[PDB]
Structure formats: C-alpha cells, structure tokens
Amino acid sequence: SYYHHHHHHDYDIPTTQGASMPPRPSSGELWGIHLMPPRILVECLLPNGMIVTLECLREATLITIKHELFKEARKYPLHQLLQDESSYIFVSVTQEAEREEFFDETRRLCDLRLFQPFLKVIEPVGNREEKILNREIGFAIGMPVCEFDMVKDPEVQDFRRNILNVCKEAVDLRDLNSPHSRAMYVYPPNVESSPELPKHIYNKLDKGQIIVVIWVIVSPNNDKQKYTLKINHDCVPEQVIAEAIRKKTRSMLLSSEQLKLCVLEYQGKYILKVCGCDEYFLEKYPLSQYKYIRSCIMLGRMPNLMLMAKESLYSQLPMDCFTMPSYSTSTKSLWVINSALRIKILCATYVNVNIRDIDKIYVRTGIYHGGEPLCDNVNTQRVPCSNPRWNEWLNYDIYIPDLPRAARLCLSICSVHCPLAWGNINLFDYTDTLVSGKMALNLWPVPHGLEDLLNPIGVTGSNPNKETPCLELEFDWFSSVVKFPDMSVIEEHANWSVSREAGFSYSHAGLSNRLARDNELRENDKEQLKAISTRDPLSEITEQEKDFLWSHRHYCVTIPEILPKLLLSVKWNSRDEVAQMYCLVKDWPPIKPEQAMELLDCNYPDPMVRGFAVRCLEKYLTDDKLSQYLIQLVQVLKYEQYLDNLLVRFLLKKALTNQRIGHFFFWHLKSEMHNKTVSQRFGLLLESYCRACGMYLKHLNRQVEAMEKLINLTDILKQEKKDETQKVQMKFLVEQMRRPDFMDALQGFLSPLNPAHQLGNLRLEECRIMSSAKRPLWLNWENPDIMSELLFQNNEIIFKNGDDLRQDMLTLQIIRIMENIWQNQGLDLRMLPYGCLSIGDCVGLIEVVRNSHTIMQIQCKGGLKGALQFNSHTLHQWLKDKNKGEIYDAAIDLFTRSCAGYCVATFILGIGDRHNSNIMVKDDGQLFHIDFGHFLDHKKKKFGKRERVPFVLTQDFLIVISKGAQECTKTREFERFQEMCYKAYLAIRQHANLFINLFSMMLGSGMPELQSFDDIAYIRKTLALDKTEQEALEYFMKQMNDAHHGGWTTK
Amino acid sequence: SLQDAEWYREEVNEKLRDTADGTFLVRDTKMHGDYTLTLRKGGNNKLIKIFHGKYLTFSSVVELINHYRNESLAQYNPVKLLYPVQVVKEDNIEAVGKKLHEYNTQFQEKSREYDRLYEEYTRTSQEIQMKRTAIEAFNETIKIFEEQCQTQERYSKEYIEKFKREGNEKEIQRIMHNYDKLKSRISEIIDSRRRLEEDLKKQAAEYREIDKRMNSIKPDLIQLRKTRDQYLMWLTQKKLNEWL
Ligand SMILES: COc1ccccc1C(=O)O
C-alpha cells in the first residue's frame, strides 16, 4: 500500500559509485601495477647477449645493481667479452614507450617508470652526455622531448626554433649586472603595485612608523641577536640595513664619527631577508609596499627580517648556463582572386549511430570570426547513417578577398536536430597562406552542456585521436599559393576607401555608417558614445549602435576605452571596413590592461587586435598584476590561431625574467597537459621555458617527483585499500612513507603553493589521511629555514587526488581580487583567499589555515552531553572563550568585517549554498568559506531566475554580530554591518567589467560551469547592471531581505 | 492586442538558443530607446532598436513587425522575420504542475544517463590510448630482446668454433641454456602483446557502443527538455521548486 504493490522487476542489489572519487586511472612504478614488490627479479641483458636475472630490492640504486650484476655475470659464460663496469650505462623501455639511457645511476629501480622489469647494458652512445639531459625537461614536462623531434608539421618545428629568439633575450637580461640581476630573477621583490597606503592601514601605524626587528648572526653561527628599530614605514631596505648596523655597532669605544665610517664599510655588504622563508627585499621600495610588511601591519605583528650577507646569498645562486638546442617562391595576393568561396565535403568514415533511432545525417558548415561572416549552410541529408558520404561543393556568399585574416571554417556532423561530432580549420595557415587542396580532419565529441549544432569557440585544428569521425574534404585551388596581403598593401587600400568616402554625395539611404556630419558631430552624439563606452562587455550592441559607432569610428579615438565595442561593430566580411580598422588599431591609444584583456578572449580573434592588446600589457601590466591574472592569460592562449604569436612571446619572456611568475606559469601549463586540446601547444611551450629557466628546472623536477609519488600513493589508497579501516590504511601510508625512495623524493623541496616556503623532512607523526572518501592526505614538514621559529616551525598542506580543484582555484582568485579592490579603495573587509593549486587531472593542493574550525566543530565541542539540541550562542561562547578583554571587541569587528565581505562575494558569484560544515571561524574571530562547489549557479541547469542567496545568516552569526543581544536585527552593531554590505556590493559593481572579462577568459578551460557567455551572464543579474546603481542597491536589499525574512529596508 | 501580441535579456537569448535562421521576438534604461527586435540569424542573435507617435511612418509596435514578417530586412540596411516564437491542453493548474515534476524526474534521470556515459566514454578513450602506448612499449621491449638473441649468436658462435675441445659440452650446453631461456621469454612477451591487442579491440568496440547510445539519448534529452520548458511557460501565464 506504500508502493501499490508495484514491482520493479529489473532492480538487482547484487552490486546494482553512488553507494566519492571520480577521475582515474594512472599506472605507477611498473606497467599495470601501482607499487613494485619490495624484492623483484630483473632481467639484465648484457653486451655479450647473456640474460642474468637478478633479484633486486624495489628501492636499489643502479650503482648497486650494476656493481652486483658485474659480480653475478662472472659466474655466467663469456665473462672476458665484457669491459670494466664503468664502461657501461643501463637502458630500458619506459611506460612512455621510449628507450631511455639511464645516466643518473643514483636513481632507484622504482623511480625509473619502467614498464617491464629489465635492463640492457651498453657503452654510452652519443658521447655528448649533458644534452641527453633533455630527460630533465621531459620529466618536468611529462612527455619525452624526442616525441617532438619526430613531429612532421612545419609549424611545430618552426615554433621550437623561432621561440629561442625569446629565450636568448631573457637569459641576456638575467646576467646583465650579475650576480644581482640573477638574485633578482630568483628572488624577485614581493611587493604591492601601489606604494600609497590605505587609510585604515596608516592609522595602525603611529603616524607613519612601524616597530621592526632586524636579526643578525655572528660566531659560530648559532647565537642570533634582535635589534628592534622603530623606523618610518616609507623608508627603504638600505636605510633600514644601516639603522640596524648603527645600533649593532654603537659603542663606548667608538666616537660618533668613527661609527659613520664603520657603517659605510658594512652597510652595502648586507641585504634584508624575511625570517622563516626565502623572501628578500632586494630593491628600493617603501618597506610598506613589500607584501610581508603590509600583512604584518594588518595582523598586529612586528616584522622579523634578517641581515644576510650578499656573499652568503650569491653563494647559493648557481649559474644558469644556457645552451642552444640541437635544432639549431613568389605568390598571389588574396585580393586578385575573383570567386566566392566553395568547399568540397567528401566522406565521413567512423560515424557511430543507431539507424533505428536516428533518421538521417548531414554536415553543417559555416565560416566564422568568433561570430559568422555569412549564412550558415548544410549539405543535403545523404547516404544517411548506413556508411555516410556526400560529394558536394558547398558555396558560401562571401568573395575570397573579403575573408578576414583570422577566418576559420567551423563544421559538424548532425542528426534528425542534433550534433554528432565537430572540428574547425583555420582558413589561412600560420604562414598567411590561403588553404587549398585536400584536408584530413578527425573530429571532437560535443561536450556536456552543449546543445548547439556547430562549436565555433572550440579549438582550431584536427583531433590527434585517430579512431574518431575522420571527415575529409577539399579546398578550391587557384593554380598558385594564395596569400593574405602585406600591411603596406592594406594601408593603401584603407587610404583609398577613406578618400573614396569623402566624394560620396549628400543623401545616403542607410547613410548609417556614412556620417554626413563632417568634422562637426552633434553634442548628443558625443554623449551617446561615452554612454556606450561604459556599458559592460555582455550588454550586446544593437545594429543601429554598431553602425552609429562605425560611422564615428574616428571620434572613437578620443574615447580609447570604446575600442572593444567598436571592433564588434566592424563588418569583418567587408575588407573595405577591416582594412580601415587595421589603420586605427595601428595607432590607437593604448589602454588599461583590465580593459585590454577583453581583447584576448574568443570574441577578438584578429592578429592586429591581439597585437594591440599585448602592446597594452607590455606597457602598463606590472609583474605583480601579471601573476594576479596569470591563470587567465595562460587560458587565453588556447584562442590564439597559431603556436607562434605575440601573447606567447610575452608570457614566455616574463616567465624567464621573474621566477615567481615562472613557477606558476610552469604549473598551470603542466596542470593542463593531460588535455589533448592543448598537450602539443603547452608541451612545446613548457619545453622552451624548461630549456631556458636554468637551475629552477632542477627544483621543478623535485616538486614534480614529489607530486608523482603522492599521486601514486593516493591511487593505491583509493583502489584495493578501499574497504579497509582508516586504521589499516594509515598503517599502509606510514609504512610506505618510511621507505627510502619516498623519504628521498618527498623531503627536501619547495612548496608548489608557494616556492618561498621550503619543505624539508616530513614529520610522519603529524602526517595523516583525512576522513573524506576521496582520501586526501594531510602532510606536514619541518620548516628548514634558519629562523623557522620566527614564522612557522611546521609547514603543512593538503594533497587531494580526486577532485577538480580548478573551480575552487578561480573563485578564490576572484575573492582575492574583490579584497584588493575593496581594501585599496579604503574599506577593510577581510577575506581569506586560502591557497589552492591544480597540478593535474583532478589533482592539487590546498593551504591549511591553522587554528580554524567549521561551525559544526564549534557546535559539537560546545553542545551539551545529553544529545538534545545545539545552541545558537555556542559559536559566540566559543568565540568569547578565545577573545577576552579589549581583545573581545576587536574579534567581533573582524568577524563582522569578514562576514560582511563573504556575504557579498558569495551572493555575487552565486557559489554553492553555505551551511555549518563549509563555513569556518578562526580563533581570532575571522570568518571564511571553503569547498565552494559550482560557482555561477550550476544546479540552475535543473529548472533555474533563482537569483540565489547562498550565505544565509542564521541566528548564530547575528548574535555574534551584535555582541550578545536579543532580537539582534535591531542593533546599531548590525546597522554598521549592513552598510558594509551595501558599500561592498557597490564597489564591486563599479569593476563589473573586469569580473565579466575574467570569467570570459576562462571559457577556454573545459570547466562545465563556464561553457559559454550566458553562464557568465548570471553575474550581470546579481550585480544588476541593466539597472541604475540606486536600483541595484534596492535589488540587493530586496534580495537579502527575503532570504532572512526581515531586516533590510532603510537608507 | 499590443500587450498580448503573441511574440512580445539573458532569458531572451535562452528563448533564441537552438531555433533556426529567421526566428524572432520583441523586447522592452528607458533613457536609451523603447522596444528591441531581437532576431536570430544562423546561430547569432541580431538586436534592432525601435524608436517611438511614430515607431518613420509606422503607427505602432504591432504595425512595424507585420510588415517585415512577409519581407526581408535588406532595404533598410545592408533574411526575414519568418518564425514568430500542446501541454495536453490541461486547464488544470495543479495537474500541469505534476507533469512538471515528472518530466523533470525523466529529464534529471536522463541527464544522469548522459553524464555517466560521458565518463565511461572518456575513461574508455584514455584506457584505450594507454593500451596503444603499452603496445608500442611492448613492441619496443620485444625489439631489444630480438636484438639480444641476435647479439649472442655472433659472439656465441665465435666461441663455439675457436677451441671446441676445450669445455665442449660443459661450455656450449650452458651457453645453449641461456639461449633457450632467451627465445621462450620472447615467446611469452609476444603473447603478452597479442593478449593486449585483443583487449584493445573489445575496449574499442565498447568505445563505439557507448557513443552509439550517447547519440541516441541526446535528441530525446532535448525534446524532454523542450516540452518541460513549454509546460513551465504555460503555467507562468515561488510555488514551483518542490516539483522541480
Ligand atoms: C555575434 O553574437 C555574439 C557576440 C558576443 C557574444 C555572444 C554572441 C552570440 O552568439 O549570441
């Protein structure tokens, strides 16, 4: 009567992942087995053709193995046909399938990635041993470099040889005024872009003065000595270095004059370290500008620097030693060709479709430029399904000269209306050459939240996966290799079309893009242009406004910021128009980077436009602001038409100039190396970076080697050792971590979250598997700095095989920006954008925040013994218990400041709904969210105008906001909080363009939450950009009011 | 009539999503324009401003559009307004609302099926290539062992013919043992590769089969979705979220 006695006949409980952990798999130490047996048999192939099979330990070095092999081969035949062992080097096939010579004989048998447990012995062929340490580069990259040498494609090979231009130029800048310039590469100053101090920071400073602490070391080393100065915030490291040496060497035996002389000799032998990490203060900036200082001031902390001798620094920095790699007709202008474009389709081959279900199938086509220059067309619905073939010439209504440089054919096979496969080709090659002949294109499947027929934004070029729908085709061939015009030629045709327009006459019906106004335009026009200028990138422009812009294209040079709008008004199918645009863009006023990144998204594919945008960055974008937005600039590379371009040459160079950038530039590229839409491109790029970054390669190699071990470790825990007790697992973990290969590979290296921190010697006592079913590891390390004690003695970060970090990675980045926006406008909401870093396919790292707890923990600790009901006040009680005295008042301010910001950030981004097990409170009272989930409202694809409030302030929070009141909604404490939320919400609304653009640039990545621009459009409604800002506030008040049911209706 | 009008920003683009070439509708800052003709053309929406007595001589919003339903837009500026765009006709309110719950449970089941199969598909893609790489690695492994049984014969059968009486079968038998191991190992290796290739085909067959059913699910996933949206469109002419 429950179920109307209805049987579900099919349902079987004999094993039916619903009943965590979704990616997998990735084989480890030997083919098909995660961890090789602790003792194993290895077949040693000798020069004399004998196969002696040694039992070796898993962890044994090739020195050890060889040393014993040349004992045990004596007992075999033909011993006198072998040279001394030192005349030999091991070699074998790896899991990457490449015969790898084993030079570093200190390596262990497990760490070789070996496929079959066997080792051939040879004398080292190719005498040039050092350059066969591309092994280092191929390890760093995780594909062998020889996999490139045997790629046919000229572009690839052209990229590798030409990109060295950029490498050589960087390495030049490095050893310019060495060693200082070297030290500057490695240890660049970590500084804000602004020297101006926010008003709230200055007020903490005792009218512009900090108390600092310089520490020094004398003999033998051990004893250190404080020298607590009280200097001006805006004085430089040199000045501070002197004031320490002064106080150090004042004396009852030295006159005042005798000090001055002993200071000068001493002063410039020293530089300022930060105690506890490898940050330095290497150039003239206001101390307050260095990030460490400004954080110390915010946290009520007294800076702890160390005087370090320049020679003990330049002791550590080894030479970069850059070496060049072993890889060291006339034509017909497009505009001559007088025919419309036609493209011959031929045969798809491998199309997998149910002929029962699906009627008939065709090929849709179109030309594109982000948006399309003509009518989209198909072919007829022929040889449907049962072996599909159409031998048609499709005819496109555009003349071949009116093709823009950046034009690309998009195509797709469809059903009857539903897309099967897709793939897009560049209509010109990287050498400017109009494509002509026969082309083999293997296709890509449509992704998850993609309903549309065709996929223009998707990546250009063929799938490299063979066994996929290979839809071949043919391009019209005009007896000659047709090329795109020179600039000289386009300038001429621009200047012609210019003067041609001057003689056009009186009326024009659809003058529309002809002015008729002359040099004198009306005042209402010049107002409607700055009106447009300001509108965000997603407020699509009307055809009126487009032609309106396109007419007054020349007055648009007065309002540079209009350019992104202007460009989307050009008709790219009229080379008359396009040529003229190429001449405005030639000498357009450069603009702010925040605006100029719009121009490297998918909707601005032209080379000249994208050049201008890089020219902007080259001028304005600082190394600080670069690493703020590096995620987005690396992502934006996918929309570049060809391997070799200006954006790549910019970033590669920045990477090779500043090693903090370099570090993250490696990891973000390496992050995406699994994804074959980029594996070639990024591989090639990563090769270049690695070949030129000098000694950081060797550092990166340790980091990589450490992550690989951890990946394997968790791969084992999440298979086979599932369905075992945490008890049993943790035995297995520690057992494993103790083995020498792990001890080697996991102990001395740099945090990938921040290579400033060193990691040495893991404390295995505090290392453990967290409770989650994804089996995240909680790892702990000794801070091996000389001054560990002054910063943290223990360094600890969580490694999580199983979850795709890159949504987290981005939201935290967005938060980080909202903070800096807010703070550098003078208003102190304190967000905690904790560190996150994806290093692979659902693999990454999360910074631990010591002394912080999920609200749920608070309430489980503070709740009464007789499990009845948890108290609203326990949060407050737990908080009071921490902060007592004048301290109490300040903790509430902080909770209220953070809680205010997170309220607004959360709402605007639409992040996953908040509740007790994903909100966190720190001992000092700051609140901050974690585990954000899907950002722009991605449960909305089910049903969805939900304009959600995800941070819904329960009683708990409200109590705490209004000290400890009853009916909290009515205190001035809360009035304050509300106004924080209102002045926060607006301040972001003023930078809405940026946030749109940042989200726009991330469409590249295959994040499901960012498939196309209307995903991004959630952020419009929630910031309320179609309204006036007075309305927007009222929208936000309303929106906030209904989630809490009362509180929000005064101003 | 002007308020009803049949056809009369983000959700405009969603109503435009996946309609054919020609489809349209009319939209409403007042200090900007008045109305807006959104018109879909080949996978790109095209926005046209409406300036308001005259909306120049056309005396209404309904006036100007009926004129361009028959005709192209080319003569005003260098396609027509062809497409001005069931539910079991249930004049029920409550019973159209349970269908909304049920089509949503059909849809949301259907999406799981499509979401599951995409993992199966992609894991299968990877696992296949892992095999292909492994086959190359096998083949390479094999070649080094083939090269070995070659390598021995040369230096082996130099030390058969020099001397012969010295050692003789105490020499050559223990040389011939080594060789017998060498080739029957290659025997195993080659079989290990074969045995991988067969699995590749069975994998690749299932690879095709996943896609085959993915593609069959897709078109009905759209119509299930499309009928659901028209159902929830019919109702709306805060109560919804429990069904959904
Ligand atoms: C040409 O139309 C667009 C321009 C920018 C972003 C999206 C679109 C669209 O296809 O609707």
Side-chain angles (χ1 to χ4, degrees), chain A residues 999-1038:
Chain A
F999 279 114
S1000 309
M1001 293 163 80
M1002 294 302 297
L1003 294 173
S1005 57
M1007 292 192 298
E1009 301 82 354
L1010 274 184
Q1011 286 294 147
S1012 106
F1013 288 96
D1014 11 57
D1015 291 300
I1016 294 170
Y1018 179 106
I1019 217 187
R1020 302 190 76 257
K1021 306 200 295 156
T1022 200
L1023 289 168
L1025 314 174
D1026 285 358
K1027 307 184 182 154
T1028 57
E1029 81 191 323
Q1030 184 55 38
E1031 282 184 321
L1033 283 143
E1034 289 154 20
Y1035 163 78
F1036 174 53
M1037 283 156 51
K1038 274 190 176 171

Side-chain angles (χ1 to χ4, degrees), chain A residues 1 38 55 79 90 110 130 248 276 317 423 487 504 586 635 637 760 798 837 852 954 957 974 1024:
Chain A
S1 110
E55 49 141 30
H79 172 253
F90 275 116
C110 40
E130 10 58 6
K248 179 193 137 194
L317 299 177
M487 256 299 286
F504 280 31
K586 195 179 167 219
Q635 281 303 319
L637 288 178
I798 312 163
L837 174 55
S852 79
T954 59
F957 309 116
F974 189 86

